[PDB]
């Protein structure tokens, strides 16, 4: 018979993934499968969309916490069993990431934290405030998925704006602050980037940043490890620095992202799933996935390894981490994504900011309705 993976995960990370799930299979005798999802349409609630009609795979590989909430909700995750998850052996802020209403439904992988990656042939030294930071824009350039909110949430949380208030632990899905004036300076600043600083024009985004990037054409972009790769490809000379303080002097406030790895529900075979995930998701296998594309491991321990402790990427992780906010993992928070299109709008000049900032909260507590039955 087969097991099989979905991995949203590509690139040589996945090919140490195929190597570690054939060594499992020498000795366990199942066949396993790994289907590359990263560049499928449907995004990362695909998942949800095929386990609801059966057609779901065994196990998921490289699944952003976020997403869980919404499948753990739906019954479509088989909960961690005793014995695989040593929470000492993590952040806290990582554990807390995979539990879903108090219950531990994925394994901690890989953490994330978006910094700015820079090409040294254009800007030797990276700029550390917003003045100098204008400065290397204007002059060689600047752009990234500016109206993607998992990114330009820095710019927004530097502002004091918040997705969910946050009380002890307990997030308020009631309590939006994406329309304080203090979002509504952020917003300002995005629409600035475009209509005064002309860094982008309303239409740049993610995959035209990252092929200007490329070809050596700017500057500074705003990306993660999953990018290392392809630039090292283009053998790009490059640096990874963290977000430069905004014109308020404030620091700018990145999402903290955990990849995930977990067991569908309806797997039949789900000791031996958890059996592979945990070869999956080991110590060697952090290891593993950290060489070519930097990804930071989640485990602590791997954390301090001398190789990862001397890389340009967790150099700007550290530096960062105590400023990134993980991103909530609570099913509302897909309602926020999905109503995130109204940022372009106010980049664009459609709407002003303080319109766009009213008509993306009701647009997301619309949703969060919509939910729930
Ligand atoms: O843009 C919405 C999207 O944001 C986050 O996805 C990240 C992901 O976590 C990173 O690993 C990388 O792939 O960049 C993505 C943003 O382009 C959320 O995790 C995801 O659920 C959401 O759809």
């Given at each position: 018979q087969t097991?099989?993976?979905?991995?949203?995960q590509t690139g040589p990370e996945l090919q140490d993934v195929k190597?570690?799930?054939?060594?499992?299979?020498?000795?366990?005798?199942?066949?396993?499968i790994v289907v590359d999802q990263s560049s499928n349409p449907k995004g990362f609630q695909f998942y949800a969309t095929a386990a609801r009609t059966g057609k779901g795979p065994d196990v998921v590989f490289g699944m952003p916490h976020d997403n869980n909430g919404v499948f753990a909700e739906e019954g479509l995750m088989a909960p961690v069993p005793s014995g695989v998850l040593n929470t000492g052996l993590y952040a806290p802020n990582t554990i807390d990431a995979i539990k879903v209403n108090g219950t531990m439904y994925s394994v901690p992988?890989?953490?994330?934290?978006?910094?700015?990656?820079?090409n040294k042939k254009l800007v030797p030294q990276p700029p550390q405030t917003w003045a100098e930071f204008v400065k290397?824009?204007?002059?060689?350039?600047?752009?990234?998925?500016?109206?993607?909110?998992?990114?330009?949430?820095?710019?927004?949380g530097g502002y004091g704006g918040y997705v969910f208030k946050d009380n002890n632990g307990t997030l308020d899905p009631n309590n939006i602050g994406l329309d304080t004036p203090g979002a509504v300076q952020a917003y300002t600043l995005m629409r600035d980037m475009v209509s005064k600083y002309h860094w982008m024009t309303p239409s740049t985004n993610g995959s035209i940043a990252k092929a200007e990037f490329?070809?050596?054409?700017?500057?500074?972009?705003?990306?993660?490890?999953?990018?290392?790769?392809?630039?090292?490809?283009?053998?790009?000379?490059?640096?990874?620095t963290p977000w430069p303080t905004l014109p308020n002097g404030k620091h700018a406030?990145?999402?903290?992202?955990?990849?995930?790895?977990?067991?569908?529900?309806?797997?039949?075979?789900?000791?031996?799933?958890?059996?592979?995930?945990?070869?999956?998701?080991?110590?060697?296998?952090?290891?593993?996935?950290?060489?070519?594309?930097?990804?930071?491991?989640?485990?602590?321990?791997?954390?301090?390894?001398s190789a990862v402790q001397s890389s340009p990427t967790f150099k700007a992780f550290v530096e960062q981490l105590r400023y990134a906010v993980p991103m909530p993992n609570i099913p509302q928070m897909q309602?926020?994504?999905?109503?995130?299109?109204?940022?372009?709008?106010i980049i664009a000049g459609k709407v002003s900011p303080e319109q766009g900032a009213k008509d993306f909260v009701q647009n997301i507590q619309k949703g969060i309705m919509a939910q729930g039955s």
């Open positions: 097991i099989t993976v979905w991995s949203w190597q570690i799930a054939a060594q499992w299979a020498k000795a366990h005798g199942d066949k396993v992988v890989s953490v994330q934290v978006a910094a700015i990656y820079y290397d824009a204007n002059a060689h350039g600047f752009m990234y998925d500016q109206a993607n909110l998992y990114f330009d949430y820095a710019i927004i490329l070809a050596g054409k700017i500057g500074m972009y705003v990306s993660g490890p999953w990018d290392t790769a392809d630039i090292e490809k283009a053998k790009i000379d490059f640096g990874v406030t990145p999402f903290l992202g955990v990849i995930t790895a977990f067991v569908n529900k309806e797997s039949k075979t789900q000791a031996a799933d958890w059996s592979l995930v945990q070869a999956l998701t080991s110590a060697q296998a952090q290891q593993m996935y950290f060489r070519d594309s930097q990804q930071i491991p989640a485990l602590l321990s791997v954390q301090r390894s309602a926020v994504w999905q109503a995130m299109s109204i940022l372009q709008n």
